Subunit: 109 residues, 2 copies
Amino acid sequence: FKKVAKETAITLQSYLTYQAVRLISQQLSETNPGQAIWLGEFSKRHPIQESDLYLEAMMLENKELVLRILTVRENLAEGVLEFLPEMVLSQIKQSNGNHRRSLLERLTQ
Amino acid sequence: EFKKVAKETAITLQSYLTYQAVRLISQQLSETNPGQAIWLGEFSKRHPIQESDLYLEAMMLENKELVLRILTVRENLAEGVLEFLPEMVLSQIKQSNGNHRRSLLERLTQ
């Protein structure tokens, strides 16, 4: 329950980073298509799932954008983290409900 | 309130906890019933856990007992872990942010 929470937090760290790049990209696509297109070719070269390696690699190519990510991911984290436990737990119960109903019906079908 | 982003993160989290459930259950089975653990291995190559609903549903065709074990374990895990994540991820991002910032500004320093 602690190894699990560590692994989960790390995954969320990567995930929110990803989500930051996504948002920045929606904006670049409108604002600097050159850069937006650049970003795509970059994330193909580099696996966003590795948050830090992704950033460290990008430090070598577009320092301004790396800093913008760090800021945006943190904004997102503060906008979003707090509502997560309610939303996930409630979603799991609902999904657990549906899957149980489904398979208990399926057993007798 | 970033709604689209909370919705997509929650969903991701839902699946990730399912994954984490499958991971424990997999460890138990590897000791208890090796045959079944092998099965759960390649089942997982045939079906991506990131789409957890589709995964559990496809599993229903093959091992309804396990589907039920997954549902229970994942909910337990959720109860154990969710509470602690907002402080944990925020404090991690801040740290990581500081390190990246400090490392980038020192790269310019050279």
